[PDB]
Amino acid sequence: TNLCPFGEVFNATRFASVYAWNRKRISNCVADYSVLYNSASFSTFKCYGVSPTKLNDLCFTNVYADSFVIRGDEVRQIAPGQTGKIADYNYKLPDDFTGCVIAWNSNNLDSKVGGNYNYLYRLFRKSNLKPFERDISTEIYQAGSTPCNGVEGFNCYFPLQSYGFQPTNGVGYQPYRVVVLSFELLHAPATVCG
Amino acid sequence: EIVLTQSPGTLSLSPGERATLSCRASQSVSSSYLAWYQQKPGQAPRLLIYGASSRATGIPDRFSGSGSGTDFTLTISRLEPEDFAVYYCQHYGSSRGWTFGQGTKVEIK
Amino acid sequence: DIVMTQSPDSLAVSLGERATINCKSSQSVLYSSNNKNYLAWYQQKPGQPPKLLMYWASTRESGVPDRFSGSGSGAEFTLTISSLQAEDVAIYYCQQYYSTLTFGGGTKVEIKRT
Amino acid sequence: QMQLVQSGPEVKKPGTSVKVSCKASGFTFMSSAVQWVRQARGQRLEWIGWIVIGSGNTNYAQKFQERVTITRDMSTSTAYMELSSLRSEDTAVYYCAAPYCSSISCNDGFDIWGQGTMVTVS
Amino acid sequence: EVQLVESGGGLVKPGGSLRLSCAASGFTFRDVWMSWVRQAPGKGLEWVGRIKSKIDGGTTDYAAPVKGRFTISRDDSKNTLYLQMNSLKTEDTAVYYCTTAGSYYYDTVGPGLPEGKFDYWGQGTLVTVS
Ligand SMILES: *[C@@H]1O[C@H](CO)[C@@H](O)[C@H](O)[C@H]1NC(C)=O
């Protein structure tokens, strides 16, 4: 009955770039989401699954935590049925998604005075992502009928673009750490309870 | 920056005659970044050839690009009154390029 | 190890005169991703440790006069001082962050006099 | 039908700055890139710089280094360029150009040019 | 204000060994990558080596001319940076500095820099080999 190590997810010193979003399994432990919900530290705590407090009475076979950093205006894209650059090319939730999306304001940590360019997002892809797909390719994006020679210049571009995260950014342009908690009921005894 | 030059700087031809325009890079890079444009006085430049050979949409069959490496050409099988214009070549490169040649003109003789 | 080189080794500049320092890397410091050039410029005076003026050579650090600005991309860059003051006499160094850390040999900037 | 529409003529004093706009229409802006070229009357075309719309990345000719800035605002579907420290030699017609872009792919050359903007410095 | 303190310099016989150290200032030491830089009199700056912050592997790297003769370590409970040099050569004569330079791009430190800047250098200490 070990307590789930939520601090390893929510208190993490570093977060993955959204183009290569981190994934961690939570299993065989005692969850507490009420401590998160009542922390009042989160700018957003929204469930598309069971309501934020009703879920505390439920057991699951597992929970997955998807961790990444995006602009505050992009937080709305982290939902089922959404479109836009993050929803289509970096991270996608299925229309059948069950779980919750939690956002935290990291402007005091992830921003840098000259700008923090270590957080990357995908700008180009040949097609939209499948739900929970993680595309980490760095291959130069091709456009047009002419084959790309692997060298940037015209109709050849690096697929990723950095965020310009700075302390002076308006709230919509401030970085937010986002954790998506996906819940599953597999044909197995539950391993996660609270 | 790569320097492009053109020759002849001026040509004089009668309508119905075959014409050839040419250019030379200070160094060879690739045919894939070469394009030719046509300009008339009072008008913006218009794309004729790209990829050093492909026709732009709506371009007549008499126009074709040619050549390779350092030396590229643009040819017209027979001149029409519409074809008397100033022409330019451009090299896109890997960027930090995109230079234009000195230009060439075809006059009516 | 990546090696940075600088030129001129030294430049005499009269007061109020514009001055520049050129440099060239053994390889590009551009990362493709982020479209950033990992080049910084440092200032050193005798008896003192060097201090940072610009980190990407595109932006000034706090306390740095607006007279200073970097330029260029890829393997080749230039630092420009729009007008030199006596307070700006120093040895200037390039630093690369592309891999580990590298410094150039540095360039001396001094006031021209008879 | 794709078209580019540029801002109209403007006259500036030396030592001042000028801004020129180029509005997109009839094609996908985000997949495109915009090139800026200027031409003095009777003179050869001169490249100034270019911008990739999706990334905002730019490059400039060494002649215009730190004299020209190119920006874009996708919500206005418009490219913008600014030139500073104007000289009488900068008098020219300024043009924007871009490849046609479908939802699938873009052309491999600058098939569409704007009508041009006259800029005079005196 | 932010101030580093350096010590352990002095004359060393060739083929000998020396331990150098630098005390941390008020800025968080443990979360900042640190490096050693040396400058011989009459010469330009030369990088010696670097150590990563605790969040990372904590691994180190060295400039090729000094590799295998130099070891970098830190004591987080004392917030002190150390350099051990072995088999010293007359070529190694230099003033040695401890710095934060180059760390800001790769470290986890936010915008809240105590002086508005992340670039800190010690005054260094002279090491002489003869
Ligand atoms: C992060 O650590 C702090 C330590 O005081 C704790 O108060 C907070 O609840 C933690 N956040 C978690 C576990 O999500």
Numbering used by the authors:
A (entry chain A): 333 to 526
B (entry chain B): 1 to 30, 30A, 31 to 95, 95A, 96 to 107
C (entry chain L): 1 to 30, 30A, 30B, 30C, 30D, 30E, 30F, 31 to 94, ...
D (entry chain C): 1 to 52, 52A, 53 to 82, 82A, 82B, 82C, 83 to 118
E (entry chain H): 1 to 52, 52A, 52B, 52C, 53 to 82, 82A, 82B, 82C, ...
Sentences from the paper on this structure:
Anti-SARS-CoV-2 mAb pair COV2-2196 (class I) and COV2-2130 (class III) are human neutralizing Abs (nAbs) that target non-redundant, complementary epitopes within the receptor binding domain of SARS-CoV-2 spike protein (S-RBD). Both epitopes overlap with the ACE-2 binding site to mediate viral neutralization. The DNA-encoded Monoclonal Antibody (DMAb) platform instructs the in vivo expression of functional antibodies using optimized, synthetic plasmids. Total IgG was purified from sera pools, digested and isolated Fabs were complexed with stabilized spike trimer from SARS-CoV-2 (USA-WA1/2020; 6P stabilization).
